[PDB]
Amino acid sequence: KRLEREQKLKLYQSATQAVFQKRQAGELDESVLELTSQILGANPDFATLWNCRREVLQHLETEKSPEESAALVKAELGFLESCLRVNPKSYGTWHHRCWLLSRLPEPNWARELELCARFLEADERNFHCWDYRRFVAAQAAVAPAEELAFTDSLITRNFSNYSSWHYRSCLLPQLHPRLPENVLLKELELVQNAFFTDPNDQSAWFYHRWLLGAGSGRCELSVEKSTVLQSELESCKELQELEPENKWCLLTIILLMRALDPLLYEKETLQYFSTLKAVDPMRAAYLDDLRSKFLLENSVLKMEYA
Amino acid sequence: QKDVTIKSDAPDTLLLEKHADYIASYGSKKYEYCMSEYLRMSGVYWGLTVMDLMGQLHRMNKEEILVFIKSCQHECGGVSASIGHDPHLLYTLSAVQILTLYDSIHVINVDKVVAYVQSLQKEDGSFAGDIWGEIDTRFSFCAVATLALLGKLDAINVEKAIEFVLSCMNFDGGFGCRPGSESHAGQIYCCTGFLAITSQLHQVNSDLLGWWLCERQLPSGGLNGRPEKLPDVCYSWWVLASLKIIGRLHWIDREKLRSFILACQDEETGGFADRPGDMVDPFHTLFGIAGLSLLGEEQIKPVSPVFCMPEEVLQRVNVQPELVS
Ligand SMILES: CC(C)=CCC/C(C)=C/CC/C(C)=C/COP(=O)(O)OP(=O)(O)O
Ligand SMILES: [Ca+2]
Ligand SMILES: [Zn+2]
């Protein structure tokens, strides 16, 4: 342990030394690509070395044949993919890939989308990869509807869904292009499946709270939406019975009652705040402030009675 | 549900003497340190700031650090992490924070720093980190914090910068790296700090964002950086500082968080780790100490939630953005 890393250190130190010497000498060649490959594998956050690689690739592009140039970029893609397998959360590595692809005549975007699907099946929460996927989708002019279909299969195949629900929150407005009610109802159905399938799973509850605000007034509640929301309310009460320590369903009961009729449900809303605070005491201060806000809203509604 | 379980013999007292000793001798033990030279300037900033919060700044090497900083400013005006490395907004900010701590801003060429920052703004208002063009709201914060400390916020296109940052606001009230990016505590800190500096906190949904942030607190008392992740002491900074900026610091359980932060100390070596019983480092030492200050620990100087520097320093340069409450 302690010995072998005294060796590694002096290797990285002399290779680092060697790279900086070559750079000061203006030697922008495959030397320096060889040296930095040996350092960036274990230390991808060494930003200056990614810069050195770019300076070399730029220089060589001017002095090499188009086929030699093409060969260097394919080698770079393989290098990059090997680096990502060891450290998939390095800002520098993902940016270098983006820099490289943006430069190309040329680029094979469907292959890059596949790379993304592969990294996301390993870690569905890797934000770097989701950011890269959005980059690739915009470059390839992938339509929001295709990306929407990708997110569905991801949410249903397993949990760890916050990143995929978040992506849906951005896509849905684009394909729209404040959701239309037919879309909102279908989303509510999808999310309500999720949180009844895995009531633990905070991401569906967060997305549902957004959906509850993303509609028309209420009360310009349609009979269909009124009925759907009332149905949700009763389903959450059932889940409360199955899972008495589940705080998300309790909060959602409160929010549904707000969405339906604040004044008619005043009594129940207050009862639910008490239960919820006992179940989730770390959020007592938040919940008291939420209750205070809701009561002030109620006073305004009552004072609107002429 | 992913959480740590704190052990019953976890430290439950603040060990300031040990932390000051740890930071004072950091990088002298010499060591595989070495490794992290690509962030040296920020490392220096973390050490100096935490020492100043603890009243121990004098035990660090002011004259040495000023020569180091001067040697890291490049011809373009930007500052690198270390000698021979390339300039970047991250290390330009750290350098300027250090010089602010030391009331030594004219050690570097301020006009050229301003010109460097100005040069990295894009047409949509965003900022690249350097000439290679990585766009991140981190760099929006670095740009306006650097300029605010220099009295030069007027040098950039502020309305366009605000527009870009607001385009990064999400369904859940938070902010990510770039438009479309998922909410992350780290980016929320950068963005709420940015909006504080530019006087735009009225554009944040404080109740919605505050809720998302307070739901970062796990049963252990520690905070994570997004849903379904493990807690980490540096979120005691990212999350609390954001909550303070938006007037909702009381939405977390302060005693439970304080207990978690104290459990991350190493009682033998000093310093703080990311989680109880892991290896300590200066980054987590600063953020643990700064978190405790936000929570009102008497032995630690009050810390600015926007700049992560002692408030007395910001008062001296007269840069204290108004927060929500
Ligand atoms: C204190 C100060 C003045 C800072 C300057 C601004 C700055 C660099 C903020 C960092 C923001 C952050 C922690 C982002 C997520 O990074 P990550 O990808 O490491 O997050 P993770 O590994 O926890 O997921
Ligand atoms: Ca000294
Ligand atoms: Zn951390």
Are A48 and B86 a contacting pair at CB < 8 A? Answer: yes
What is the distance between the alpha carbons of residues A103 and A76, in angstroms, rounded to a whole number?
Answer: 13
Is the C-alpha dihedral spanning A144, A122, A81, A43 positive or negative? positive
Q: Is B226 helix (H, G, I), strand (E, B) or coil?
A: coil
Report phi then psi at B80, rounded to 5. -90, 165
DSSP-assigned states of every residue in A198-257: -TT-HHHHHHHHHHHHSSS-SSS--HHHHHHHHHHHHHHHHHHHH-TT-HHHHHHHHHHH
| Max intra-chain CA distance, chain A | 85
Are B207 and A293 a contacting pair at CB < 8 A? Answer: yes
CA dist A143 → A100, A136, A177 (Å):
23, 12, 12
CA dist A41 → A5, A47, A49, A80 (Å):
15, 12, 11, 9
- Say how many C-beta atoms besides its own lie within 10 A of residue A219's C-beta: 9
The residues that bridge with B135 in the sheet, in sequence order, are B128
CA dist B206 → A259, A297, B151, B245, B251 (Å):
20, 17, 28, 9, 11
Residue A268, both tokens: 């129940």
From atom 5 of ligand 1, which residue's Cα is the shortest distance away?
B142
| HSE-CB for A276 with a 13 A CA cutoff | 24
Q: Which of B2, B42, B92, B138 should be mutated for ligand 1, with most atoms under 8 A from CB?
A: B138
Q: Please name which of B324, B323, B285, B283 lies closest in space to residue B306, comparing C-alpha atoms.
A: B323
Are B170 and A125 a contacting pair at CB < 8 A? Answer: no
What is the distance between the alpha carbons of residues A281 and A283, in angstroms, rounded to a whole number?
Answer: 5
CA A80-A84-A87 angle, to 5 degrees, is: 135
Residue range of the domain that includes A18: 1-306
The residues that bridge with B217 in the sheet, in sequence order, are B223
Q: Kindly tell me the number of DSSP H helices and DSSP E strands found in chain B.
A: 13, 0
Q: Please name which of A180, A192, A130 lies closest in space to residue A172, comparing C-alpha atoms.
A: A180
- Judged by a CB distance cut-off of 8 A, whether residue A130 touches chain B is yes
CB B189 within 8 A of CB B241: yes
CB B117 within 8 A of CB B89: yes
- Judged by a CB distance cut-off of 8 A, whether residue B68 touches chain A is no
What is the distance between the alpha carbons of residues A166 and B99, in angstroms, rounded to a whole number?
Answer: 40
What is the distance between the alpha carbons of residues B226 and A288, in angstroms, rounded to a whole number?
Answer: 24
What is the distance between the alpha carbons of residues A216 and A89, in angstroms, rounded to a whole number?
Answer: 40
What is the distance between the alpha carbons of residues B175 and B250, in angstroms, rounded to a whole number?
Answer: 21
Burial A6-45 (b: 16+ CB within 10 A, else e): eeeeeebeebbebbbebbeeeebeeebbebbbebbeebbb
What is the distance between the alpha carbons of residues A190 and A245, in angstroms, rounded to a whole number?
Answer: 24
DSSP-assigned states of every residue in chain A: -TTHHHHHHHHHHHHHHHHHHHHHTT--SHHHHHHHHHHHTT-TT-HHHHHHHHHHHHHHHHHS-HHHHHHHHHHHHHHHHHHHHH-TT-HHHHHHHHHHHHH-SS--HHHHHHHHHHHHHH-TT-HHHHHHHHHHHHHTT--HHHHHHHHHHHHHH-S--HHHHHHHHHHHHHS-----HHHHHHHHHHHHHHHHH-TT-HHHHHHHHHHHHSSS-SSS--HHHHHHHHHHHHHHHHHHHH-TT-HHHHHHHHHHHHHH-TTTTHHHHHHHHHHHHHH-GGGHHHHHHHHHHHHHHHHHHHHT--
Amino acid in position A191: V
Is the C-alpha dihedral spanning B240, B241, B242, B244 positive or negative? positive
Burial B211-243 (b: 16+ CB within 10 A, else e): bbbbbbbbebbbbbbbbbbebbbbbbbbbbbbb
Considering every ligand atom, which ligand is closest to the CA of A87? Answer: 1
CA dist A2 → A5, A8, B111 (Å):
6, 10, 47
- We report the CATH number of the domain holding residue B99 as 1.50.10.20
What is the distance between the alpha carbons of residues B16 and B56, in angstroms, rounded to a whole number?
Answer: 10
Question: Nearest residue on chain A to B176, judged by CA atoms?
Answer: A127
Total number of domains in chain B: 1
Residue B286, both tokens: 């600063």
- Say how many C-beta atoms besides its own lie within 10 A of residue A304's C-beta: 7
CA dist B311 → A52, A112, B145, B242, B290 (Å):
39, 47, 14, 16, 11
Question: Which residues in chain A are contacts of B172 at CB distance < 8 A?
Answer: 166, 206, 210
What is the Å distance from ligand 3's center to A110 Cα? 35
The residues that bridge with B79 in the sheet, in sequence order, are B73
Name the experiment that determined this structure: X-ray
Q: Please name which of B294, B306, B50, B41 lies closest in space to residue B153, comparing C-alpha atoms.
A: B306
Q: Is B184 in the pocket of ligand 1 (CB under 6 A)?
A: yes
- Say how many C-beta atoms besides its own lie within 10 A of residue A109's C-beta: 16
- Residues with C-beta atoms within 5 A of ion ligand 3: B 232, 234, 274
Is the C-alpha dihedral spanning A150, A154, A155, A156 positive or negative? positive
Residue in A20, A163, A210 closest to B182 by CB: A163
Burial A70-102 (b: 16+ CB within 10 A, else e): eebbeebbebbeebbeeebebbbbbbbbbbbbe
| Max intra-chain CA distance, chain B | 55
Total number of domains in chain A: 1
| Residue showing tokens 């449900």 | A265
What is the distance between the alpha carbons of residues B230 and A220, in angstroms, rounded to a whole number?
Answer: 42
- CA–centroid distance for B123 within its chain: 27
Distance linking the first and last C-alpha atoms of chain B: 31
Q: Is B225 in the pocket of ligand 1 (CB under 6 A)?
A: yes
CB B284 within 8 A of CB B33: no
Residue A107, burial from CB neighbour count under 10 angstroms (0-12, 13-18, 19+) = middle
Is the C-alpha dihedral spanning B73, A95, B172, A172 positive or negative? positive
The residues that bridge with B169 in the sheet, in sequence order, are B175
Residue A125, both tokens: 């929460």
Residues with Cβ < 8 Å from A96, sequence gap 6 or more? A50, A53, A54, A80
Residue range of the domain that includes B118: 1-325
CB A126 within 8 A of CB A89: yes
Considering every ligand atom, which ligand is closest to the CA of B229? Answer: 1
Question: Nearest residue on chain A to B1, judged by CA atoms?
Answer: A200
- Judged by a CB distance cut-off of 8 A, whether residue A46 touches chain B is yes
Q: Is B107 helix (H, G, I), strand (E, B) or coil?
A: helix
**Helix/strand/coil percentages in chain B, nearest 5:** 50, 5, 45
Provide the phi-psi class of B271: left if phi over 0, else alpha when psi is between -120 and 50, else beta. Answer: left
- Judged by a CB distance cut-off of 8 A, whether residue B123 touches chain A is no
Q: Which atom of ligand 1 is nearest to the CA of B226?
A: 24
Is the C-alpha dihedral spanning A117, A118, A120, A126 positive or negative? negative
CB B125 within 8 A of CB B71: no
> Resolution to 1 decimal, in Å?
1.9
What is the distance between the alpha carbons of residues A145 and A176, in angstroms, rounded to a whole number?
Answer: 10
**Helical segments of B102-154, H only:** 110-119, 137-150
What is the Å distance from ligand 3's center to B232 Cα? 5
Q: Is B311 helix (H, G, I), strand (E, B) or coil?
A: helix
| Residue showing tokens 């000498």 | A25
CB B41 within 8 A of CB B99: no
What is the distance between the alpha carbons of residues A255 and A203, in angstroms, rounded to a whole number?
Answer: 16
HEC letters along B3-18: CCCCCCCCCCCCCHHH
Residue A50, both tokens: 């990614």
What is the distance between the alpha carbons of residues B142 and B223, in angstroms, rounded to a whole number?
Answer: 24
Breakpoints of chain A, after residues (C–N > 2.5 Å):
177
CB A103 within 8 A of CB A90: no
Is the C-alpha dihedral spanning B21, A4, A82, A119 positive or negative? negative
- CA–centroid distance for B243 within its chain: 14
The residues that bridge with B281 in the sheet, in sequence order, are B272
CB B201 within 8 A of CB B324: yes
Question: Which residues in chain A are contacts of B229 at CB distance < 8 A?
Answer: 125
Please identify among residues 210-269 of chain A the ones whose CB lies closer than 8 Å to any CB of chain B.
210
What is the distance between the alpha carbons of residues B168 and B138, in angstroms, rounded to a whole number?
Answer: 12
Q: Which atom of ligand 1 is nearest to the CA of A128?
A: 18
What is the Å distance from ligand 1's center to A92 Cα? 14
Q: Is B193 in the pocket of ligand 1 (CB under 6 A)?
A: no
Distance linking the first and last C-alpha atoms of chain A: 80
For residue A306, the distance in angstroms to the closest alpha carbon of chain B comes to 31
DSSP B62: H
Q: Please name which of B22, B50, B16, B19 lies closest in space to residue B308, comparing C-alpha atoms.
A: B50
Please identify among residues 184-203 of chain B the ones whose CB lies closer than 8 Å to any CB of chain A.
184
- We report the CATH number of the domain holding residue A268 as 1.25.40.120
| Residue showing tokens 């000051």 | B20
What is the distance between the alpha carbons of residues B243 and B250, in angstroms, rounded to a whole number?
Answer: 8
CA B74-B79-B83 angle, to 5 degrees, is: 75
What is the distance between the alpha carbons of residues A190 and A197, in angstroms, rounded to a whole number?
Answer: 11
Residue in A20, A283, A289 closest to B84 by CB: A20
Q: Please name which of B44, B32, B102 lies closest in space to residue B72, comparing C-alpha atoms.
A: B44
CB B120 within 8 A of CB B139: yes
What is the distance between the alpha carbons of residues A113 and B295, in angstroms, rounded to a whole number?
Answer: 45
Please identify among residues 186-215 of chain A the ones whose CB lies closer than 8 Å to any CB of chain B.
200, 202-203, 206-207, 210
- Judged by a CB distance cut-off of 8 A, whether residue A160 touches chain B is yes
Provide the number of CB pairs (under 8 Å) joining chain A to chain B: 102
HEC letters along B275-302: CCCCCCEHHHHHHHHHHHHHCCCCCCCC
DSSP B183: P
Amino acid in position B205: N
